[PDB]
Write a protein that binds this ligand. Structure first.
Ligand SMILES: NC(=O)c1ccc[n+]([C@@H]2O[C@H](COP(=O)([O-])OP(=O)(O)OC[C@H]3O[C@@H](n4cnc5c(N)ncnc54)[C@H](OP(=O)(O)O)[C@@H]3O)[C@@H](O)[C@H]2O)c1
Ligand SMILES: NC(=O)c1ccc[n+]([C@@H]2O[C@H](COP(=O)([O-])OP(=O)(O)OC[C@H]3O[C@@H](n4cnc5c(N)ncnc54)[C@H](OP(=O)(O)O)[C@@H]3O)[C@@H](O)[C@H]2O)c1
Ligand SMILES: Nc1nc2c(c(=O)[nH]1)N1C(=O)N(c3ccc(C(=O)N[C@@H](CCC(=O)O)C(=O)O)cc3)C[C@H]1CN2
Lengths: 287, 295
């Protein structure tokens, strides 16, 4: 009766080992060349501090040079833009991202900041240029946001093809839900996107051969709602009376065929995909 | 109940009259100000010439200043790009579009040309930057491609709110299907997108309280498939020969209209439905661009 456990910790480790071998070979082929990632943080949130360290540690194990720039809570939009512009022009820097959410005492427009990022270095894939390419089916030449990229990879580890399947995405955020739809749609699923104004959410979820939940409501998607045999991808990271997903795992694992645990599921794959995007940016720059 | 007929010909006429009144008032409020559209053509295709005249005539009736720049077939990519760049920088020009397809004797990359358009003037809404803004929820100020804009307007003329309805889009094209999803999603429908690899397309369509079909397969979506009470938006323009018609051809939609009209509550006929909304929507987008510039 248990669903097969998609082990994001093992799978991300396989990916990071592969990338390390890729990165080793670029240094042997072009000695002294170093792929380089930069992460720009605003404020000092404890969760952002933790997530940034995980990105930095994965990078340094692969042989990527990872720079961390922490700006204080007093920072303004103009200052943030000056750094974006400097990283744009610093040719030693192949990929960079702005960690979200921004922790400033001033108003800052997240979209204007992200959209100043040079699209060739937009490893998080959150620029409108990259979003627009993904949303319209032009996957040849954009970055894809790291969380949905990781989710797509996890779905593929099942061996079950996506084409013609009815997939359901619960959530439509810029970072996960909306690009998750687009990735599923352009891999030929029939995709239903749900959100907070969706009526009869249970009956929608029950149609999902593929289910990707990204809502930030702890365990809200019950196991009864899960289609028997579904692939369940749980993007949730919620702290409770302990970390739980957006899916009620214990009840969902009896119904699903493949499921992502929390932690050890989507989380470590998000970082592996960031590193993959960083190495692609470094490879394209060598031309 | 036979379905209420959404008359695109009347509704587009109401919109064009209203925009004219809007445009008159902006000139009286801010004297000297002239909303301005530019259309850039390459070559001399007969269909493009016809479509451009219709756009220009609608614009001049509204009081929009409409510039037509027709470049010869000998034109190169570099020349086309130089014009795009000049219209980008010409501050008197609020909206512009490149009419497609381009008719040149030289190779020209249509995607690179379109994507050089400044996103703030992209009234046809096809740039990647504008598509991305629409796709991720920035409907306050992005441009919307004219066909799905027209579809959204027609849905609203019913008075039936969109929020929490299950909507179905059959088709995912850059021109119609994909931007149609985004409009529906950001008006709080739960949206299911279908395409050529969708299995059991009939049973998907049957879940649609709102249905927007844009496939180019004549009458493929049968009336049986339609959910009782649905709003049916038919984007199809498919020609079938017919000697009983003045010009020897009939137009049918992507929906089997006669069988679908018994099941739906509101439906768009073909012709006279989505089609005549097209140009009015370009003009509406042009005035939005002019209004934002006035600030
Ligand atoms: N593992 C990773 O790498 C990773 C990355 C990013 C985020 N996350 C985690 O994933 C979760 C969500 O992330 P996010 O960035 O996508 O969040 P977000 O921006 O807060 O958006 C959450 C989405 O869930 C929808 N939602 C909320 N309540 C709902 C309900 N009752 N029924 C249906 N849908 C509902 C919202 O709809 P509306 O748009 O209508 O508000 C929204 O689209 C959080 O736990 C977050 O920590 C994980
Ligand atoms: N009145 C106007 O001004 C106006 C403007 C633009 C378009 N239109 C009309 O709208 C229609 C569609 O145009 P378009 O530009 O979207 O066409 P398109 O670019 O050819 O795309 C057609 C879409 O329909 C899908 N499709 C095709 N056969 C299907 C099937 N058997 N089952 C399900 N989906 C199927 C295709 O699937 P795949 O994604 O799998 O290829 C694709 O997504 C045409 O009749 C066109 O003339 C009207
Ligand atoms: N622009 C931007 N902002 C952002 C992200 C982003 O991509 N781009 N995000 C991440 O990196 N996040 C994340 C989440 C989890 C982890 C992570 O490694 N835990 C694992 C631990 C895995 C294990 O080793 O067992 C987990 O949740 O299970 C590592 C980064 C969250 C989100 C927050 N904000």
């Amino acid at each position: 009766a248990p669903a097969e456990i998609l082990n994001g910790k093992e799978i991300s480790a396989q990916i990071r080992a592969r990338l390390k071998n890729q990165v080793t070979q670029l240094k042997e082929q072009v000695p002294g060349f170093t792929p380089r990632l930069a992460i720009l943080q605003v404020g000092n949130r404890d969760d952002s501090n933790l997530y940034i360290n995980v990105k930095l540690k994965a990078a340094e194990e692969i042989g990527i040079k990872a720079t961390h720039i922490k700006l204080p809570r007093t920072t303004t939009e103009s200052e943030v833009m000056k750094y974006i512009t400097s990283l744009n022009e610093d040719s030693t820097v192949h990929g960079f991202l702005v960690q979200l959410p921004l922790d400033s005492e001033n108003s800052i427009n997240t979209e204007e900041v992200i959209n100043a990022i040079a699209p060739e270095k937009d490893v998080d894939g959150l620029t409108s240029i990259n979003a627009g390419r993904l949303a319209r089916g032009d996957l040849n030449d954009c970055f894809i946001p790291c969380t949905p990229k990781g989710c797509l990879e996890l779905i593929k580890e099942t061996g079950v093809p996506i084409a013609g399947r009815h997939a359901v995405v619960v959530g439509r955020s810029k970072i996960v839900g909306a690009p998750m739809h687009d990735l599923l749609l352009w891999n030929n699923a029939t995709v239903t996107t749900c959100h907070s104004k969706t009526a009869h959410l249970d009956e929608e979820v029950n149609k999902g051969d593929i289910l990707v939940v990204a809502t930030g409501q702890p365990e809200m998607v019950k196991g009864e709602w899960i289609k028997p045999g579904a692939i369940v991808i749980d993007c949730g990271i919620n702290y409770v009376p302990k970390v739980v997903g957006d899916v009620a795992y214990d009840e969902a694992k009896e119904r699903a065929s493949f499921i992502t645990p929390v932690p050890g599921g989507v989380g470590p794959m998000t970082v592996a995909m960031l590193m993959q995007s960083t190495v692609e940016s470094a490879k394209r720059f060598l031309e």
